[PDB]
Amino acid sequence: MSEVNIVVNGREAGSKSKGCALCGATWGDYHADFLGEDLFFCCDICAAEFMNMMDEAFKHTARHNVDELHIDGNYQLGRNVLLKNGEDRLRFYVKFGPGAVIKEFKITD
Known part of the structure; x- marks a missing residue:
């Protein structure tokens, strides 16, 4: 069971x-x-x-200036499961998302 997905929004x-x-x-x-x-x-x-x-x-570096989200899972990784959910929003945002794991999926979703 290898699952590693992290999502950071505005260095939250x-x-x-x-x-x-x-x-x-x-x-x-x-x-x-x-x-x-x-x-x-x-x-x-x-x-x-x-x-x-x-x-x-x-x-x-990605979340240094802009924003980047990537998720990859491999049974060869090293059986490492890290679940990080970051939810952040401000007037600056118009999409005003709930900032949920779903965001991570956005990578493709």
């Missing part, structure tokens, strides 16, 4: 990605976070694992 928070991937003892969104819903600005030692896909890095 709400998950335990604030801390580290291993454990979240601290908080802070000042730094960036990969699809691994983890921040390597606290420890960056046990956190920020490469077990994920390189895209993870791009994600940061």
Whole structure:
């Protein structure tokens, strides 16, 4: 069972990605976070694992200026299941979405 889907809208928070991937003892969104819903600005030692896909890095850059969402699942990945749901909206938006997993699907849906 390999399922990895992450969706970030306007560098939104709400998950335990604030801390580290291993454990979240601290908080802070000042730094960036990969699809691994983890921040390597606290420890960056046990956190920020490469077990994920390189895209993870791009994600940061993607959600750095614009917005990008990608979901891929493979039984060879490493049996890693990460579910991150980010919901954010503002007057700037006209589509005003509920910001749900459905968004992730948008990748194709």
